Amino acid sequence: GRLIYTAGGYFRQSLSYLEAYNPSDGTWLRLADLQVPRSGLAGCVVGGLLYAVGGRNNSPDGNTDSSALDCYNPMTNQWSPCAPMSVPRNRIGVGVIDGHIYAVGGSHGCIHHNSVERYEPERDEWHLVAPMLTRRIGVGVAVLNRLLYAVGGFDGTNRLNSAECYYPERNEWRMITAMNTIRSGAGVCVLHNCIYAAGGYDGQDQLNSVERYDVATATWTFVAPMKHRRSALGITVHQGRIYVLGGYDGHTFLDSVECYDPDTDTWSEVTRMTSGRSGVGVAVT
Numbered sequence: 001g002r003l004i005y006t007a008g009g010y011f012r013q014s015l016s017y018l019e020a021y022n023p024s025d026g027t028w029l030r031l032a033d034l035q036v037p038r039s040g041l042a043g044c045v046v047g048g049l050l051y052a053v054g055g056r057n058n059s060p061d062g063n064t065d066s067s068a069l070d071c072y073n074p075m076t077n078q079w080s081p082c083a084p085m086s087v088p089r090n091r092i093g094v095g096v097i098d099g100h101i102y103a104v105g106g107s108h109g110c111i112h113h114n115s116v117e118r119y120e121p122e123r124d125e126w127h128l129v130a131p132m133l134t135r136r137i138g139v140g141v142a143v144l145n146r147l148l149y150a151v152g153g154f155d156g157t158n159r160l161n162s163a164e165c166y167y168p169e170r171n172e173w174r175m176i177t178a179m180n181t182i183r184s185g186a187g188v189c190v191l192h193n194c195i196y197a198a199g200g201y202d203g204q205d206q207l208n209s210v211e212r213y214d215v216a217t218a219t220w221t222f223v224a225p226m227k228h229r230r231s232a233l234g235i236t237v238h239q240g241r242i243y244v245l246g247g248y249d250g251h252t253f254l255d256s257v258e259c260y261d262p263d264t265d266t267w268s269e270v271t272r273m274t275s276g277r278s279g280v281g282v283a284v285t
C-alpha cells in the first residue's frame with residue numbers, strides 16, 4: 001500500500017502542504033505541514049522516510065532560498081530537521097543511490113549552481129562530489145544503471161536541451177545525447193530502463209510533449225503528449241505508471257494529476273489535488 005506524497009509548492013506564496021494520494025481507492029490524506037513553506041523543492045525516499053530538499057520561501061514579507069533537509073516519518077506523522085546543505089538550492093533536482101541522496105544544481109540568488117553534494121542518512125552528513133559540466137537550475141534528475149543523470153534546466157543565460165551523466169565510482173560527469181526539445185522545469189523520472197522527460201519550459205512556451213531516452217540506442221524519442229501543458233511539475237512512478245502532479249502553464253497553477261500507461265502509450269487524468277500549485281516535491285513509500 002504505497003502512497004504518492006506531495007510536499008510544498010507555490011500558489012500566490014510558497015506552500016507548507018504535505019498530502020498523500022492513494023491510487024487504489026483515490027483518497028487524499030492530510031498530513032503534518034512542513035515547518036517552513038517551500039517552493040521549487042525536490043522530494044525523495046530512503047528507508048521508508050520521506051525527505052524534502054532545498055527550495056525557496058516566497059512570501060509577502062520576502063524571499064529566502066533554502067539549504068534545508070527535513071525528514072518525515074509516516075509512522076509518527078512528524079517532520080524532523082536534518083543537517084543542512086553546503087549552499088541553498090532553489091529549483092533543485094534530487095536522486096538516490098545506495099540510500100544516499102544526491103542534491104543537484106539549483107539557484108541561490110544570482111548564483112546558478114553546477115555543484116553537487118551527497119547525503120548520508122546513517123551519519124547525518126553532506127559532502128561535495130564532482131561538479132556538473134554545466135550550471136543547471138530547474139534540472140530534472142533520474143537514476144538508471146547506478147548512474148545519476150542530470151537533464152535540461154537553465155544556466156542563467158539559456159534554457160537547455162542538453163543532458164549529462166554522473167559516475168559515482170569514478171566521481172566524474174560525462175555529456176550524453178541532448179533532448180529533442182529545450183526543457184527547464186520538466187518532470188524527469190525512470191520507468192522500464194528509460195528516462196522520461198515530461199513537460200517544462202523551452203524559453204517561449206510551457207510544454208505538453210514527453211520524450212524518452214533509451215540507453216542502448218542512445219537516442220531521445222517522443223511518446224504521447226500530456227493533455228495539459230505544464231512546467232515545474234511533480235513527478236513519480238507507482239506500479240509501472242508515471243504520475244505527474246500539478247504545475248504552471250503560463251496563466252494557471254494546475255491541480256490536475258495525469259497518469260501515463262507505457263503499454264497503451266496514453267495519458268489520462270486520474271485525480272485532482274486539493275488545490276492548484278506548481279514546484280512541488282514528490283516521492284513514493
Ligand SMILES: O=C(O)[C@H]1CCCC[C@H]1C(=O)N1CCc2c(OCCO)cccc2[C@H]1CN1C(=O)c2ccccc2C1=O
Pocket residue numbers: 010039040041042056058090091092137138139184185186231232233247248278279280281
Ligand atoms: O522559484 C521562484 O523564484 C518562484 C517565483 C514565484 C513562482 C514560483 C517559483 C518559480 O518560479 N517556479 C516554481 C519552481 C520551478 C522549478 O522547480 C522545480 C522543483 O520543484 C523548476 C523550474 C521552474 C520553476 C518556476 C516555474 N514558474 C512558476 O511557477 C511561475 C509563476 C509565475 C511566473 C513565473 C513562473 C515560473 O517560472
